[PDB]
Write an enzyme that holds these catalytic residues in place. Structure first.
Site, mmCIF file in Angstrom:
data_model
loop_
_atom_site.group_PDB
_atom_site.id
_atom_site.type_symbol
_atom_site.label_atom_id
_atom_site.label_comp_id
_atom_site.label_asym_id
_atom_site.label_seq_id
_atom_site.Cartn_x
_atom_site.Cartn_y
_atom_site.Cartn_z
ATOM 1 N N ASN A 55 3.395 -75.821 36.490
ATOM 2 C CA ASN A 55 1.922 -75.908 36.535
ATOM 3 C C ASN A 55 1.410 -77.004 37.457
ATOM 4 O OD1 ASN A 55 1.568 -73.698 34.962
ATOM 5 N ND2 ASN A 55 1.049 -74.821 33.082
ATOM 6 N N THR A 96 5.348 -74.518 26.330
ATOM 7 C CA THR A 96 6.729 -74.094 26.540
ATOM 8 C C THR A 96 7.667 -74.948 25.697
ATOM 9 O OG1 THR A 96 8.325 -73.425 28.285
ATOM 10 C CG2 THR A 96 7.275 -75.577 28.627
ATOM 11 N N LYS A 102 4.081 -78.851 32.417
ATOM 12 C CA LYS A 102 5.441 -78.403 32.751
ATOM 13 C C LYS A 102 5.484 -78.346 34.274
ATOM 14 C CE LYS A 102 4.298 -73.488 32.169
ATOM 15 N NZ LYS A 102 4.699 -72.225 31.534
ATOM 16 N N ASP A 107 -3.532 -73.832 35.697
ATOM 17 C CA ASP A 107 -3.317 -73.108 34.437
ATOM 18 C C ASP A 107 -3.910 -73.876 33.253
ATOM 19 O OD1 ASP A 107 -2.784 -71.408 32.390
ATOM 20 O OD2 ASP A 107 -0.694 -70.978 32.985
ATOM 21 N N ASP A 109 -0.388 -77.756 28.435
ATOM 22 C CA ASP A 109 0.576 -76.914 29.128
ATOM 23 C C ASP A 109 1.262 -77.678 30.234
ATOM 24 O OD1 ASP A 109 1.968 -74.494 29.184
ATOM 25 O OD2 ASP A 109 0.516 -73.504 30.458
HETATM 26 C C1 LIG Z 1 -3.685 -72.351 43.909
HETATM 27 O O1 LIG Z 1 -2.495 -71.573 43.661
HETATM 28 C C2 LIG Z 1 -2.383 -71.172 42.391
HETATM 29 O O2 LIG Z 1 -3.185 -71.384 41.509
HETATM 30 C C3 LIG Z 1 -1.156 -70.405 42.167
HETATM 31 C C4 LIG Z 1 -0.308 -69.982 43.120
HETATM 32 O O3 LIG Z 1 0.656 -69.302 42.421
HETATM 33 C C5 LIG Z 1 0.377 -69.397 41.091
HETATM 34 C C6 LIG Z 1 1.330 -68.662 40.192
HETATM 35 C C7 LIG Z 1 2.732 -69.214 40.327
HETATM 36 O O4 LIG Z 1 2.638 -70.640 40.206
HETATM 37 N N1 LIG Z 1 0.881 -68.643 38.793
HETATM 38 C C8 LIG Z 1 0.781 -67.487 38.100
HETATM 39 O O5 LIG Z 1 0.855 -66.396 38.655
HETATM 40 C C9 LIG Z 1 0.550 -67.549 36.581
HETATM 41 C C10 LIG Z 1 0.472 -66.101 36.058
HETATM 42 C C11 LIG Z 1 -0.653 -68.347 36.052
HETATM 43 C C12 LIG Z 1 1.796 -68.229 36.067
HETATM 44 N N2 LIG Z 1 -0.754 -70.062 40.902
#
Ligand SMILES: COC(=O)c1coc([C@@H](CO)NC(=O)C(C)(C)C)n1
Length: 339
Positions: free
Chosen positions: A160, A190, A157, A173, A155
């Site tokens: 991530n 993607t 991209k 992710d 994944d």
């Molecule tokens: C340590 O911070 C994170 O792991 C973090 C902060 O925000 C995210 C968000 C936006 O990138 N990801 C999501 O909500 C997904 C649903 C997996 C796409 N992950």
């Protein structure tokens, strides 16, 4: 290099011990306060939370079990948690706790407050080659680590790759990551980042991660991906042709690296030859990179994200805030027994 070989042998031993005996049930929902939704998808979301006793902030990924089942992501969600609780590398977001309840699965990860690389790239337009190379080196080392554990990431991209307080990357992710000694078959990733052998429904291997690295480096240095088109079918036609046009501002070394990563014939692709990752690490585009210094986080980063503290959400965007409902009845208990 014996020191790298011995590092990777220890890394694999430590991974296997946790892989064979995974941790389970190491927190619970009412130990945390919900703060804000940081992202949301068709079966899951990530929320900023605060631990009520320590005050620490975390990014809690919440997956709805029923939606995971409907979207055929059972195995993928079990892969994600089992892998994340077993890995340990400077450039991977750390899983701190996990647990489940009647309705949801939860992975409580460290919170990286600097935002996605994607936001920063789209804001500035494109990164200079030194800036792209700093991030690329971290991905090369991370894929060397993962692949040595027989893990395929699948994944890569810019969304991530989170940017930490020191300006280094944390890959997040693991929803498509899998332990694969040989080939695997699932269509996932993607569109702009998919290797030709995924598009063509072949049994594919870790070489798909090295293809995706080529796409990422191109997009970082150009500001747009190499096979861009308006709709997926047109993106897929460009990928399998593999015809690429490079901006004239790309260095000759960059174009040479990218032609070898964006090689349609997977048996000729850098990262997948006899010398493995060393064809990439020893390429002229990386001649200025001190691989050990990058791993040790001793290189000054190109860019330190602006944020006010470990609770600041300003580098993520705004979503409708939805309930975290927990049914009085257990859902999908059998499917998620091992989580
Ligand atoms: C340590 O911070 C994170 O792991 C973090 C902060 O925000 C995210 C968000 C936006 O990138 N990801 C999501 O909500 C997904 C649903 C997996 C796409 N992950």
């Amino acid at each position: 290099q014996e020191s790298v070989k011995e590092f990777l042998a220890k890394a694999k031993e430590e991974f296997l011990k946790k892989w064979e005996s995974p941790s389970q049930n190491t927190a619970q929902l009412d130990h945390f306060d919900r703060i804000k939704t940081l992202g949301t998808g068709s079966f899951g979301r990530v929320m900023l939370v605060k631990h009520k006793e320590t005050g620490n902030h975390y990014a809690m990924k919440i997956l709805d079990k029923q939606k995971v089942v409907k979207l055929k992501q059972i195995e993928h969600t079990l892969n994600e948690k089992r892998i994340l609780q077993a890995v340990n590398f400077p450039f991977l977001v750390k899983l701190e706790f996990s647990f489940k309840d009647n309705s949801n699965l939860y992975m409580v990860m460290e919170y990286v407050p600097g935002g996605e690389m994607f936001s920063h790239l789209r804001r500035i337009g494109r990164f200079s080659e030194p800036h792209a190379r700093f991030y690329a080196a971290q991905i090369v080392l991370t894929f060397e680590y993962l692949h040595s554990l027989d893990l395929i990431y699948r994944d890569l991209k810019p969304e991530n790759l989170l940017i930490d307080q020191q300006g280094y990357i944390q890959v997040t992710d693991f929803g498509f990551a899998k332990r694969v000694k040989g080939r695997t078959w699932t269509l996932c990733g993607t569109p702009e980042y998919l290797a030709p052998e995924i598009i063509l429904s072949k049994g594919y291997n870790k070489a798909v991660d090295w293809w995706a690295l080529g796409v990422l480096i191109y997009e970082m240095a150009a500001g747009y991906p190499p096979f861009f088109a308006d709709q997926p079918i047109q993106i897929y036609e460009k990928i399998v042709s593999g015809k690429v046009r490079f901006p004239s501002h790309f260095s000759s070394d960059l174009k040479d690296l990218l032609r070898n990563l964006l090689q349609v014939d997977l048996t000729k692709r850098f990262g997948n030859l006899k010398n493995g990752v060393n064809d990439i690490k020893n390429h002229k585009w990386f001649a200025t990179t001190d691989w050990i210094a990058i791993y040790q986080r001793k290189v000054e980063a190109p860019f330190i994200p602006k944020f006010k503290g470990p609770g600041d959400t300003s580098n993520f965007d705004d979503y409708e805030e939805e309930e975290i409902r927990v049914s009085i009845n257990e859902k999908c208990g059998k499917e998620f027994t091992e989580f």
